[PDB]
Write a protein that binds this ligand. Structure first.
Ligand SMILES: [Mg+2]
Length: 193
């Protein structure tokens, strides 16, 4: 509600962590940007408009992995050829997700929180599920680690509202412990799925 973690510490940890991981992965960030510039597209970064804290829209950064080659007809060539071989390798290693660390540093996102979903889901949320945006979206979160017993979207949102209601340092540490434990490694919200 008004503790010093929800109103101060969590943001400070987000800033220190995003800054550290940006420096820690900076050679990979520069290398990935160089390859994409010469092999994929000279516009290295593209943004994804997503609703964030208080449903405020932000630009979620991501590396481009597909080309802009269309058919003279005007339509873009399918993903079959537009995704180079290295494009898969960048995707499989989630290297294109590294710019999201900057969204965390910007305050657009947190290290822990609900997943930033499509802007089309805003009218579909019910008044209970809309509380999922009472906190910053996260790279990981409570619903993300509970992907085994939550195949439906309403179960993931129940974890989202529960997280925004009970946001504490101990809950974040718990979510972080379960995320490491993931050492072991489609429908689209319709209002009833
Ligand atoms: Mg990826």
């Amino acid at each position: 509600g008004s503790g010093m973690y929800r109103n101060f510490l969590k943001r400070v940890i987000d800033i220190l962590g995003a800054l550290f991981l940006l420096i820690l992965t900076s050679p990979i960030i520069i290398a990935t940007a160089i390859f994409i510039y010469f092999k994929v597209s000279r516009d290295v970064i593209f943004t994804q408009a997503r609703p964030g804290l208080n449903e405020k829209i932000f630009k979620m950064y991501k590396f481009k992995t597909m080309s802009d080659e269309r058919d003279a007809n005007g339509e873009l060539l399918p993903d079959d050829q537009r995704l180079g071989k290295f494009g898969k390798l960048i995707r499989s290693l989630s290297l294109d997700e590294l710019p999201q660390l900057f969204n965390v540093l910007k305050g657009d996102m947190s290290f822990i929180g609900p997943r930033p979903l499509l802007v089309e889901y805003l009218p579909i949320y019910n008044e209970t599920q809309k509380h999922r945006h009472d906190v910053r979206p996260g790279i990981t979160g409570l619903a993300q680690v509970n992907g085994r017993n939550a195949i439906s979207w309403e179960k993931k949102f129940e974890y989202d509202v529960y997280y925004a209601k009970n946001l504490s340092f101990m809950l974040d540490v718990k979510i972080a412990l379960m995320t490491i434990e993931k050492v072991l490694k489609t429908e689209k919200f319709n209002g009833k799925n």
